[PDB]
Amino acid sequence: GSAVPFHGAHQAGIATPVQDRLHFAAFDVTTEDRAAFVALLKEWTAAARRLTAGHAVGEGAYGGLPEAPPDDTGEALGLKPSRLTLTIGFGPSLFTRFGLADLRPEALADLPKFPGDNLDRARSGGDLCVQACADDPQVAVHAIRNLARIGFGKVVVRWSQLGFGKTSSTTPDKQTPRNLLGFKDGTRNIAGTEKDRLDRFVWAAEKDGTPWMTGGSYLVARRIRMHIETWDRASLQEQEDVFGRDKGEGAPVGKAKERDEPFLKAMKPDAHVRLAHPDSNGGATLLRRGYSFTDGTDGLGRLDAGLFFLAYQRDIRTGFVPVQRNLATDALNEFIQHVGSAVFAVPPGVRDADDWWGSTLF
Amino acid sequence: GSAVPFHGAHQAGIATPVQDRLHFAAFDVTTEDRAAFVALLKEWTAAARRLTAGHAVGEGAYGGLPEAPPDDTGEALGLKPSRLTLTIGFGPSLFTRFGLADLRPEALADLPKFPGDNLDRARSGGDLCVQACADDPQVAVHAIRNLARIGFGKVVVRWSQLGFGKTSSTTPDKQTPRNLLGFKDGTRNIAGTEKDRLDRFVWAAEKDGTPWMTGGSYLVARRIRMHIETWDRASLQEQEDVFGRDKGEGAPVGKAKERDEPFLKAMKPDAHVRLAHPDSNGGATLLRRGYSFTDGTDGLGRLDAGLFFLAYQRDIRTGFVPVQRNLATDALNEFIQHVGSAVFAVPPGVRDADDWWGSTLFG
Numbered sequence A: 001g002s003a004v005p006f007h008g009a010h011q012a013g014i015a016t017p018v019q020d021r022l023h024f025a026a027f028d029v030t031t032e033d034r035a036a037f038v039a040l041l042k043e044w045t046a047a048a049r050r051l052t053a054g055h056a057v058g059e060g061a062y063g064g065l066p067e068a069p070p071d072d073t074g075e076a077l078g079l080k081p082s083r084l085t086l087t088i089g090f091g092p093s094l095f096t097r098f099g100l101a102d103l104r105p106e107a108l109a110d111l112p113k114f115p116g117d118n119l120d121r122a123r124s125g126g127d128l129c130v131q132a133c134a135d136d137p138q139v140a141v142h143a144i145r146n147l148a149r150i151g152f153g154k155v156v157v158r159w160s161q162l163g164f165g166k167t168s169s170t171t172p173d174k175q176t177p178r179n180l181l182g183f184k185d186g187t188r189n190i191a192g193t194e195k196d197r198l199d200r201f202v203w204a205a206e207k208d209g210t211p212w213m214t215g216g217s218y219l220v221a222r223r224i225r226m227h228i229e230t231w232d233r234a235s236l237q238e239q240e241d242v243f244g245r246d247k248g249e250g251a252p253v254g255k256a257k258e259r260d261e262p263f264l265k266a267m268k269p270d271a272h273v274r275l276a277h278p279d280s281n282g283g284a285t286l287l288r289r290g291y292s293f294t295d296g297t298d299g300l301g302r303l304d305a306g307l308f309f310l311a312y313q314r315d316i317r318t319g320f321v322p323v324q325r326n327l328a329t330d331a332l333n334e335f336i337q338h339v340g341s342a343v344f345a346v347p348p349g350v351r352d353a354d355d356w357w358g359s360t361l362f
Numbered sequence B: 001g002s003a004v005p006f007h008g009a010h011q012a013g014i015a016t017p018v019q020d021r022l023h024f025a026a027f028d029v030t031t032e033d034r035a036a037f038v039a040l041l042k043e044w045t046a047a048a049r050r051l052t053a054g055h056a057v058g059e060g061a062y063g064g065l066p067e068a069p070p071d072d073t074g075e076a077l078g079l080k081p082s083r084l085t086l087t088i089g090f091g092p093s094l095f096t097r098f099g100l101a102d103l104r105p106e107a108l109a110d111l112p113k114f115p116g117d118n119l120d121r122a123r124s125g126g127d128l129c130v131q132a133c134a135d136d137p138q139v140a141v142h143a144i145r146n147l148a149r150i151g152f153g154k155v156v157v158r159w160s161q162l163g164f165g166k167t168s169s170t171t172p173d174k175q176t177p178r179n180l181l182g183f184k185d186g187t188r189n190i191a192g193t194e195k196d197r198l199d200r201f202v203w204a205a206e207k208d209g210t211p212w213m214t215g216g217s218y219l220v221a222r223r224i225r226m227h228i229e230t231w232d233r234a235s236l237q238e239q240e241d242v243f244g245r246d247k248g249e250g251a252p253v254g255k256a257k258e259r260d261e262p263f264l265k266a267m268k269p270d271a272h273v274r275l276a277h278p279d280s281n282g283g284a285t286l287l288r289r290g291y292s293f294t295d296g297t298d299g300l301g302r303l304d305a306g307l308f309f310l311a312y313q314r315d316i317r318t319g320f321v322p323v324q325r326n327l328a329t330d331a332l333n334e335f336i337q338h339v340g341s342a343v344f345a346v347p348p349g350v351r352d353a354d355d356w357w358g359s360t361l362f363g
């Protein structure tokens, strides 16, 4: 129920312990006025400071002038902060506006087409994103709703994704959650305590070539549909062979415990863990921070199910791209399809009460 | 606060404490073979007994024969029972199968068309429902996914809805949840503690005319979209006037406290509370047990959110129908739209370890 501090050198919501719920929204910008957009970023920052401390935005949810709409929509009244974090990112398309073209980071790379991609263009891309994570879904929806309202006339929601449960871990001392295939997901991640590993693999450094991004990170989002009918008829051995870990304990094949180190040569050559492991990818390491989703039925008699995969990294070209390229032969590909994609530059943290989202860029 | 008993005279999930999360699924039946369907109901009951105790279905999620698919899909391993309840219901369309046409309860009435209805046929109806409620949404989803799998070849999933209420880890049990319009929702309801009110208004009695339904109830489900962005532009006064209660405290107009009894004549004539109150409907009283939903954003960038309204009652004709008819002129209608609907007969409880869902109907 506690608050996660909002200010810092880095934005919260990355290294932070992974909260139970996600509401992710991508926005397109509809104003060509730079000053108007800067004013929005400041108003959003002010709102975020309220929201993440469990307070209502603006002058509150009630007790104002009867003839005015309340400043806050009110559905989070009486609720705790619930570890709400709000993380903003800027998409490549933003940099075509406001004279920003030459400030687009090299590390904000467009992704290549990957074999098997079936990307919905309507649920891909976006000028900007807001990741809202919290332990209470109502708290997360309230935050996104109120930001969108404040931004009316300057930004529109392009697409959104709710995540009902986490499929990631930045806290190895706590139980690793399972994805909808029934496997633990998050054992070998980067922990929030691993400052050296965060600095090496997650945070952008001044020397990487884009000074305004120092202390930021780069985000890849992939909406992945799971073929659960196909998976559910697979044998136990087939499932375990796909991953290279057993299902019950989630230990590497041959070993007894979840957190025993993988011995890659005992896994099938097309096992997911074997192909995704840093040692298979020249050391490339990601911070995975995704969530599960179900968006109803598929119209063919079955539940829809998927994973909204989020990865943070210091450079898209040295993080997600090499690892995904190496997944071209993954046994897991029989059971999944990527159907949405976006990339974002996640700026540095809001340093104090006078700072604002995007201040280093603008 | 860990598990809710599965067995009882009544199915759990109606009068038992309201859990934080919902996964509601409607199923259509694909078999014409009564014996095959009965067999399914027995297998589903066996699975439900395991699921509600926090155990995997069948022989488990791992450790069986390597060359066999696991009996349980495994995504709830490591989780707690989470107060899971599984409540089954039978839709009117089920009664056109298996020779059951003369056993359809008269209280399982088809709803009339109501003004402003915009029902999506794909997210309406269904031969069967399973209401899965739990504090952890993964526990609920796991239940529905595994029931659907056990039933594959005999049933299909027609439509599915996830919902949320409060989060109990951080929110006191007594506090009334707010809906997504920002108003407290549930103040004047039937509580599961009110045994006599449940007998009067919720449970079917034998003398009501359908003996197999004694101890059961009737469910109306309505997927109600809110026009969030239009609502959020309304003034505070307009919003309070729509309901007849203030937004901060949720007190009736002219009163000080949430739980103060309303004075209906102080409210506007078409205020929601005034139109919905039992006194305005000949005493008709409902058990509301709905959940909020937020599914995403639509193609216009608007929030696809609302209330997945669930009401339990002793007879649809004397519960939901009169009350919803009375909402024809509700000021709230400007801001909502009913976009899905279904009705179900919820049979009596599973009495003991040898009983099974639907045993009073199938025999």
Ligand code: HEM
Residues within 6 Å of the ligand: A179, A181, A183, A184, A185, A186, A187, A188, A189, A222, A224, A226, A243, A245, A262, A272, A273, A276, A277, A278, A286, A307, A309, A320, A323, A324, A327, A336
């Ligand atoms: C639906 C899609 C996916 C599923 C179900 C899945 C599942 C898993 C599982 C069960 C593990 C083992 C436990 C762990 O260490 O986390 C794992 C590990 C991993 N996955 Fe995935 N994954 C998916 C997609 C991806 C994608 C798209 C990437 C990257 C492009 C990826 C990268 C990784 C990495 C880096 C590891 C850790 C390998 C190691 O260092 O041991 N996964 N995944």
Ligand code: HEM
Residues within 6 Å of the ligand: B179, B181, B183, B184, B185, B186, B187, B188, B189, B222, B224, B226, B243, B245, B262, B272, B273, B276, B277, B278, B286, B306, B307, B309, B320, B323, B324, B327, B336
């Ligand atoms: C999105 C749709 C709806 C919203 C936002 C809504 C909201 C509310 C709110 C805020 C209250 C007052 C507090 C309370 O006592 O719970 C209320 C009361 C009530 N509502 Fe609704 N409602 C909706 C739909 C319906 C429908 C479809 C029905 C029935 C057909 C209904 C029946 C009732 C009843 C019976 C009461 C209690 C009245 C009393 O006895 O004081 N509501 N609703």
